[PDB]
Design a protein around this nucleic acid. Structure first.
Lengths: 43, 112, 47, 120, 89
RNA sequence: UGAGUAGCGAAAGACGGGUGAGAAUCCCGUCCACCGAUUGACUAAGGUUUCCAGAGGAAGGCUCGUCCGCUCUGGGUUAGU
RNA sequence: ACCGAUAGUGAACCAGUACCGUGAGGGAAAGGUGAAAAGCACCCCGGAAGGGGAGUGAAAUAGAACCUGAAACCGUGUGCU
């Protein structure tokens, strides 16, 4: 049966990329939130 | 006198190794060795190696006669158990127990 | 299809009365010293 | 007769293999059940070889496989030729017997009573 | 420059078989091209280079009991001489 | 506890040598058979060292293992088209 | 007149780390050899693991090392039945 989550390198970086998160104001908050927690991976 | 030998962390369920320990309990060293070479089990080979070591200790450290020895005690205790997992019908997972064993044999001549 | 009550140590040890192994034939050899199974191929080949 | 946990065709194929392997080295070791089934198949093949007529040759080629035995001095010969050769000469005054079974100890992998079937 | 470009030589069973002819393997930097490699190996050993081959290597993962980590990126380079030799003791 | 109970998820295997403390399961050989518009041969997406050699299976791989597309210790990818 | 490793921060140790989710996000378990490594030379059984001696030490306390209870559970031997 066809399951969900079809792996794709290009799309992955074109949606959850660092530049994509730094293109809006809401996305910037996410980075700030993760940085405060101390997460090793930001994106 | 008395001589003993133990085998710790033996990968074998204690309930399966206790079935071959009730055939050489109270027998002679000669008979016991012969019964372990005729028994068709997966514990006989391991138990035979332990009994052999027990006899060598009584003929070297105590220098006793190995032609008049008799198996006095013979039991098997439990040891650390390993935890494993294997998938089921849906997204459930059953548990598997890989128990070990602590075989012990005490050979003597029956004299204080 | 599921146990109504747990089994005790008495009933559990009573069911394991015939659950055991039996001593084999073990025929003596005429010239070898070691033992062997009856009707087998060795130095005794039974007795 | 026994079925040896196999299909009609599979069982017929295995029997032919064992028989041919018991005429190449004349000393094979297998299980007891299979040893009591190939003992009444290789005995019939020897009987055909004793005849030595053309009819038997064709009847003996409906069971024996196509193999190449290697003797001394770089000598080669098919199993069929060997069956109608030395083998036929050896047993010419003995009426019955031929094969013989010898019991052994159990296997390690499983508790199967292994035996040894050889020609007398 | 023309001294930090090459790190150290490579001595293996493959290099020895490639050492039969005028071909040597060297560990260059991970930022220099082939042109610079050929303009830095013929000025240190005073020889004539014919061609140069370069290949990258992804970092390999390692471990040693509750200790994760990776290796450093490596840039192999095979130089071919037209006439001469290299004293690689 | 239920219990030494349910289960152990794709093709047909036979014997002879070999190695080894130990072989139905590993290596070589001869038969035999199955897929056969595919359980064949390529390229892409994806995965990211699983690839090769020599040592160990002590844990893992639904049994065994001297090995298991396989897990623990050395090396391998070259372009003016 | 705060806590003393299920407590006190989610985190005394490999913590926002194993792992889980496409993503925002969620989020653990795990402290203690001895005063001093003086960490069992050497012999015996065994393929090895493990053991029996012998040694160091006040004491094996021996690298699943302070104490080591159970609701537990699993055994071996015996006095009455």
């Amino acid at each position: 049966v066809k399951r969900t989550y079809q792996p794709n390198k290009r799309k992955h970086s074109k949606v959850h990329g660092f530049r994509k998160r730094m293109s809006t104001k809401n996305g910037r908050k996410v980075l700030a939130r993760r940085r405060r927690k101390g997460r090793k991976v930001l994106s | 006198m008395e001589a003993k030998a133990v085998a710790r962390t033996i990968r074998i369920a204690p309930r399966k190794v206790r079935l071959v320990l009730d055939l050489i309990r109270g027998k002679n060293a000669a008979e016991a060795i012969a019964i372990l070479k005729l028994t068709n089990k997966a514990s006989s080979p391991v138990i035979e190696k332990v009994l052999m070591s027990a006899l060598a200790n009584a003929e070297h450290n105590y220098d006793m006669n190995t032609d008049e020895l008799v198996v006095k005690e013979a039991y098997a205790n439990e040891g650390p158990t390993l935890k494993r997992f294997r998938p089921r019908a849906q997204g459930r997972a059953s548990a598997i127990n890989k128990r070990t064993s602590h075989i012990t044999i005490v050979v003597s001549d029956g004299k204080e | 299809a599921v146990p109504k009550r747990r089994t005790s140590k008495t009933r559990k040890n009573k069911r394991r009365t015939h659950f055991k192994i039996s001593v084999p034939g073990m025929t003596e050899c005429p010239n070898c010293g070691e033992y062997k199974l009856s009707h087998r191929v060795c130095k005794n080949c039974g007795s | 007769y026994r079925k040896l946990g196999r299909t009609s065709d599979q069982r017929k194929a295995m029997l032919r293999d064992l028989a041919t392997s018991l005429i190449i080295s004349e000393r094979i070791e297998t299980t007891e059940a299979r040893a009591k089934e190939v003992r009444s198949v290789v005995e019939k093949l020897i009987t055909l070889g004793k005849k030595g007529d053309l009819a038997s040759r064709r009847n003996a080629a409906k069971t024996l496989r196509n193999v190449e035995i290697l003797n001394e001095d770089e000598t080669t010969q098919t199993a069929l030729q060997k069956l109608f050769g030395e083998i036929a000469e050896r047993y010419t005054e003995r009426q019955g017997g031929y094969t013989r079974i010898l019991k052994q100890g159990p296997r390690r992998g499983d508790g199967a009573e292994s035996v040894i079937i050889e020609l007398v | 420059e023309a001294r930090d470009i090459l790190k150290r030589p490579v001595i293996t069973e493959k290099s020895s078989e490639a050492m039969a002819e005028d071909k040597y393997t060297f560990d260059v930097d991970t930022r220099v091209n082939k042109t610079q490699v050929k303009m830095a190996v013929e000025e240190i050993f005073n020889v004539k280079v014919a061609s140069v081959n370069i290949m990258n290597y992804k970092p390999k993962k390692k471990r040693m009991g509750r200790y994760q980590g990776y290796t450093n990126k490596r840039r192999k380079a095979i130089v071919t001489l037209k006439e001469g030799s290299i004293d690689l003791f």
